């Protein structure tokens with residue numbers, strides 16, 4: 649997260665860290681046994697870390713649970729990142745408490761202007777590299793599709809949406825991928841991609857979760 653702030657220990661209870669020997673992507677807990685993340689975050693041997701704040705210090709509220717199954721969206725396209733979403737089932741149910749809680753799925757799509765909360769342990773620099781140990785937060789508005797399309801060198805589909813700032817300075821970044829974009833208490837987006845980080849005319853692109861609720865529900869009910 650570039651231009652954000654320190655969230656505060658466990659103030660984003662649904663935020664998870666995907667670990668394969670080190671933190672590499674974020675995710676969101678949608679119920680005691682399932683996590684939602686980005687398909688481009690797929691890797692074998694994923695361990696889901698819940699109740700985390702500082703990912704390098706055992707603070708006492710963590711729960712480390714390995715994945716028993718990973719399901720990348722059937723139509724994921726690695727070249728365009730269209731359908732960049734993935735479901736991860738935990739080997740054992742997470743223990744829900746005040747610091748570990750699930751986030752609700754959308755019943756409708758969000759509209760431009762709506763304020764959302766984006767969080768992650770990704771890079772905090774737009775012109776360099778500096779990874780934080782504690783969770784970072786950023787309030788960002790959903791923007792009109794035109795906002796991202798105007799200067800984009802890549803395809804932006806109906807399964808993606810634009811959020812952030814056009815004058816740069818604030819944006820999600822590498823390491824934040826797979827993380828949540830929560831608006832009005834619902835998980836509306838998944839950190840997916842962008843050209844650089846917090847660059848002028850180049851806001852972040854997020855997977856539009858409201859388009860996948862049917863697939864998510866059917867999949868977890870059958871697995």
Ligand SMILES: [Ca+2]
Nearest residue numbers: 702705706707
């Ligand atoms: Ca920790």
